[PDB]
Amino acid sequence: MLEVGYTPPGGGNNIGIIAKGKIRDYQHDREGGDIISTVSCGDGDKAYRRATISKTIPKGTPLTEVVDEIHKEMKKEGIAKGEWSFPDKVKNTQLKRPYSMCGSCTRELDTLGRSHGFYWNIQNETMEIIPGNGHLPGSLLITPDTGLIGTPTITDNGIKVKALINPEARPNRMMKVKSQVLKMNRKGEDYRISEVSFNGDNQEGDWIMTLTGEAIGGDKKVDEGKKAK
Amino acid sequence: MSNLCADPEALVEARIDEVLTQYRESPYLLNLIRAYLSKLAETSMSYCDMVEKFDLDTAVGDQLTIIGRILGFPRCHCVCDTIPVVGYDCGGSYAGSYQLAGYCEPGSSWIHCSPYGNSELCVDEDEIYRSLLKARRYQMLGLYDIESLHEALQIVWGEDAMVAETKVGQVVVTPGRSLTATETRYLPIVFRALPIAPGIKGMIHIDQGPIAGYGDGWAGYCGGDWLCPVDPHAYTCS
Amino acid sequence: MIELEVLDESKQKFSVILNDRRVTIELWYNTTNDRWSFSLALDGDNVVTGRRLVTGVDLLAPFGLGIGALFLLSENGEPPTRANLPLGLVKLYHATQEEIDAAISA
Amino acid sequence: MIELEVLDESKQKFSVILNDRRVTIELWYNTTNDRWSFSLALDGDNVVTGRRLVTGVDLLAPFGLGIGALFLLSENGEPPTRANLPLGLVKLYHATQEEIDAAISA
Amino acid sequence: MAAPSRIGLALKKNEQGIADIYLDASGNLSMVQNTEAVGQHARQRLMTYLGEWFLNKNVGVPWLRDLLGKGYDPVLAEAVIKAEILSTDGVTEITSFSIRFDQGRRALEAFDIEVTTEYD
Amino acid sequence: MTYGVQPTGYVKKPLAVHLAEIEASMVDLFGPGVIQTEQSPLGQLNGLYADLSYDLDERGEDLYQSFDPEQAEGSRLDILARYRLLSRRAGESDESFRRAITNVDRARIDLSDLSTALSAINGVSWSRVYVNEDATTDADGIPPNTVSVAVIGGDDDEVAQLVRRYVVPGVGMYGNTTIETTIGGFCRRIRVIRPVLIPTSVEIDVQSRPLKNGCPPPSVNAMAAGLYTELTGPDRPGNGEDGTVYLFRKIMERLYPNVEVVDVRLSQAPAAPTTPPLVMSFFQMMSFNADDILVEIVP
């Protein structure tokens, strides 16, 4: 657990979890005489290593019961279930021929994604699934009146926005971004959240987060970008 | 709870208090705002009559129908009965094949009414449907004992009602009073609402008067009568 | 449906995703007759050019582009003028064929 | 079981993993009736909205959401108030179904 | 980029000197337009006391904090009045300003204030 | 005060009534000389606030209909059912679940609690409840003062533990399958019916009766598939239901009123179809196959 936030003299508490940690590697350091303890942690890191499944799976079985099946083994390793939103093509597909599973869960999780074009990820010991062109419910406002730093920087698909770390910002959500520049950039307001970056300090380096989002179209679909085979 | 809401004039003035000093004495602007806000406050007051309009002891009309459909006892039921039909008997008397109504009967139904066209006697009086729902509360909970069936009967019929005998599979009840025609016609529906265990047959006293015998709670020579259980035909024509 | 913003510029050009298509719409004011015209490009090809923006009708019906309907609306049918269209007194809306069908069925 | 902290804010929102589901809870105070209310969303889908916080009952029982029991307690059975809920004089708890079963069997 | 049009409810001072909404001769509500609207809005802004509005305590003029008291000062009074008039939307400049003080009445009187709006 | 909650329901004040009240308030404030035409500054304000007042009326109607199972939907439909502590079935629709709460006829409001709790069990495809409450055995074979249950599916432990708490002590059960149950050490043997499925072969001869030479009867397959659906639905023939010409005609005309059923023919498969009735005992049920049904149009 790495809990970050703002604790103003009045107000209240804004502190929430931005990263839940399974220690990766630690190492002290002297600079003058100091001792800085540089921690690295683990994200689903018990599942990226020790999760191995055992599956015979027959024909006719729908195309989601076994995301539950794989989550059984990934749950033996202490992973929680997030929101799963499959593609519509996925929700309705059935089976002609049987479905090997022997080896490593994450490895053939990746082949899953490459094979039906969907995203899955682990966000603080909770595993979410979304479509490539879709996102999950939950919106977050970023404006010069709501924590905006500089540009809502424009990109090919969407934006990359800096702000003060303020905990809700999760991948696979929606951010509504307003400024005095995006209007003449004609860029929308709603964007999916794909990349999240947290950099901060307690004394000098203010809490800063940067969010990369790929724009949602008029169709309520994300601007995927040209996937190269 | 308690008083949910207050008088609209209280809410509106509570908001008028928040006006600015430069407008505190603008009678046209303040009265315009009062006209626009008092109407909304008055519209919303009307909701504070969705609180006890569903009280089982005093509900009427659609509010009682809604309670009945929550409790699972509808206002009307299929029966083996020639429901009276509102209409004229060609004055003195006409042969016909129906029976007629005269502005005061629970069997309110026309030729063209849908429940009537399929034999659904519909309970129109609230003071009887309310009693039927109060009794249905007992079937709901499965309170089949005497100590509960007696309160079911007190509510349906009156203080003189009693439960008489427990033979093998057959239980007798009595209102303890002469029944009026409305109650007589609705009687088949009373035995669908009373708390009597399934597989056990409900009876009714013939004269609907208190039963006689020995002991503490019954009626003697004056007022009592000899028992005679008869089939109310609550579910059958036979 | 989605509302399309109009800037207070005589000539302008934006891009929107409609029915999973990248659509480039370019609006320009004709001062000689005091009107707005639009050109529409689907995936780089200008399929529509020089069409007047008029209220109350589907501007794309003649073309069968498969991207739904674009239409202008106003409170009382006032025509879209230089001042009126940027201010939003007349608004530009896009609706899909599905939404149009469901609304008709309503 | 666990205790869920309540901030001194008339409207607050947080997320917790209950039975390995991400449950987002939103509490808001209603001044007119002086009572706290909660909405619950299971992994981004709003499933419970506008329920009143009441002490001594399972708040999630009607819905069969499969996320255990969410209940409020106080020493002398007071009702939750704007002042009393954030102060911890009334505590919000989550109990897992297995724990509930074990207590009932014990 | 011509000046946008503005409109608001008109206020006229009744016989008691208190400004109120007015219905014109035709009987329909009188609305002021581009420049009268700005002038009246500037007045309504000057007439507000800081922290008086319950939804926004940051609006208003700090009369009771800065000027009303034992401190007659033309410079601060001019600064406050000019700031509040200028912050009004639609006002471009103030071309003239006079301030004087009547000790007998303890009246701070600002007069000869000329305001130029974006409508020229 | 004729509006709001009235003995006939929630009566809505019309938008025009709202606007008239607002105008009457403004006439008293400004005088008879005020202008309120629908296009004037004051008329526009009156329109906006009349719309807001009517929207409050809409909320009132919503709040009144949220307590009415016939209009309540979703989680509040479940909360209403929680008064009798009923529960919804998986995938069950609001129509279906409101029929259970209302007890639409049911033909006997009693034992509806048992009928619905039974249907709420997992796996129970079909269920039915019977009673013999006289002092004599009925023609169906049920002894007097007895409750009979017919169920398809669901585990016997769960079914019997449920039936035991609905059937009181002193009242017997009639059936062909026995389940031994125990609560607190006392053992009651619950008898239920697990109807034996007899495959039935069905052949129907129909005639075409076009209502005013309009839409003609559908194809033979389009009729056999519909008849199979009807016979497999929740209104399928029950146990002890003999196959008769009437039973099938009442279905064929109802589904396709432009068709006259001339000759029904039934048999116990694989035997040849013959003259009805096909007698089914109280423990037997007719089971149909999507191929066995055949329909033939006769000149």
PDB file of C-alpha atoms in Angstrom, chain C residues 27-81:
ATOM      1  CA  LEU C  27     -17.964  24.936 -43.059  1.00  0.00           C
ATOM      2  CA  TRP C  28     -17.645  28.254 -44.843  1.00  0.00           C
ATOM      3  CA  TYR C  29     -19.802  31.352 -44.882  1.00  0.00           C
ATOM      4  CA  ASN C  30     -21.008  32.769 -48.181  1.00  0.00           C
ATOM      5  CA  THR C  31     -21.431  36.503 -47.562  1.00  0.00           C
ATOM      6  CA  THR C  32     -22.934  37.323 -50.953  1.00  0.00           C
ATOM      7  CA  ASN C  33     -26.071  35.383 -49.968  1.00  0.00           C
ATOM      8  CA  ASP C  34     -25.527  35.279 -46.182  1.00  0.00           C
ATOM      9  CA  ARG C  35     -25.450  31.509 -45.720  1.00  0.00           C
ATOM     10  CA  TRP C  36     -23.322  28.600 -44.606  1.00  0.00           C
ATOM     11  CA  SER C  37     -22.086  25.834 -46.884  1.00  0.00           C
ATOM     12  CA  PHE C  38     -20.405  22.599 -45.884  1.00  0.00           C
ATOM     13  CA  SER C  39     -18.108  20.115 -47.554  1.00  0.00           C
ATOM     14  CA  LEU C  40     -17.763  16.580 -46.231  1.00  0.00           C
ATOM     15  CA  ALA C  41     -14.872  14.177 -46.763  1.00  0.00           C
ATOM     16  CA  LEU C  42     -15.042  10.484 -45.896  1.00  0.00           C
ATOM     17  CA  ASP C  43     -11.581   9.011 -45.378  1.00  0.00           C
ATOM     18  CA  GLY C  44      -9.905  11.792 -47.373  1.00  0.00           C
ATOM     19  CA  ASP C  45     -12.253  11.895 -50.376  1.00  0.00           C
ATOM     20  CA  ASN C  46     -14.509  14.951 -50.576  1.00  0.00           C
ATOM     21  CA  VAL C  47     -17.807  13.225 -51.354  1.00  0.00           C
ATOM     22  CA  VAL C  48     -19.971  16.301 -50.637  1.00  0.00           C
ATOM     23  CA  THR C  49     -19.017  19.856 -51.564  1.00  0.00           C
ATOM     24  CA  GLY C  50     -20.747  23.215 -51.523  1.00  0.00           C
ATOM     25  CA  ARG C  51     -24.029  22.314 -49.838  1.00  0.00           C
ATOM     26  CA  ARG C  52     -26.109  24.898 -48.030  1.00  0.00           C
ATOM     27  CA  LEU C  53     -26.915  24.384 -44.366  1.00  0.00           C
ATOM     28  CA  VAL C  54     -30.703  24.504 -44.002  1.00  0.00           C
ATOM     29  CA  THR C  55     -32.875  23.886 -40.961  1.00  0.00           C
ATOM     30  CA  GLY C  56     -35.221  20.979 -40.348  1.00  0.00           C
ATOM     31  CA  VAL C  57     -33.956  18.454 -42.912  1.00  0.00           C
ATOM     32  CA  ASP C  58     -31.347  15.719 -43.228  1.00  0.00           C
ATOM     33  CA  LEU C  59     -28.535  17.279 -45.259  1.00  0.00           C
ATOM     34  CA  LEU C  60     -27.068  13.868 -46.178  1.00  0.00           C
ATOM     35  CA  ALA C  61     -30.201  12.061 -47.393  1.00  0.00           C
ATOM     36  CA  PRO C  62     -29.424  12.386 -51.148  1.00  0.00           C
ATOM     37  CA  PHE C  63     -26.002  10.740 -50.879  1.00  0.00           C
ATOM     38  CA  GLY C  64     -26.369   7.420 -49.047  1.00  0.00           C
ATOM     39  CA  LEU C  65     -23.071   7.841 -47.204  1.00  0.00           C
ATOM     40  CA  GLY C  66     -24.009   5.444 -44.397  1.00  0.00           C
ATOM     41  CA  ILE C  67     -22.979   7.866 -41.636  1.00  0.00           C
ATOM     42  CA  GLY C  68     -26.445   8.778 -40.380  1.00  0.00           C
ATOM     43  CA  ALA C  69     -28.024  12.204 -40.479  1.00  0.00           C
ATOM     44  CA  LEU C  70     -26.753  15.763 -40.061  1.00  0.00           C
ATOM     45  CA  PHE C  71     -29.356  18.466 -39.511  1.00  0.00           C
ATOM     46  CA  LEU C  72     -29.859  21.970 -38.149  1.00  0.00           C
ATOM     47  CA  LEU C  73     -32.436  22.988 -35.547  1.00  0.00           C
ATOM     48  CA  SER C  74     -33.628  26.202 -33.918  1.00  0.00           C
ATOM     49  CA  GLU C  75     -36.240  27.324 -31.405  1.00  0.00           C
ATOM     50  CA  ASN C  76     -38.595  28.703 -34.084  1.00  0.00           C
ATOM     51  CA  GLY C  77     -37.093  27.764 -37.446  1.00  0.00           C
ATOM     52  CA  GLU C  78     -34.959  30.881 -37.782  1.00  0.00           C
ATOM     53  CA  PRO C  79     -32.499  30.335 -40.649  1.00  0.00           C
ATOM     54  CA  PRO C  80     -28.794  29.916 -39.834  1.00  0.00           C
ATOM     55  CA  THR C  81     -27.034  33.263 -40.200  1.00  0.00           C
TER      56      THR C  81
END
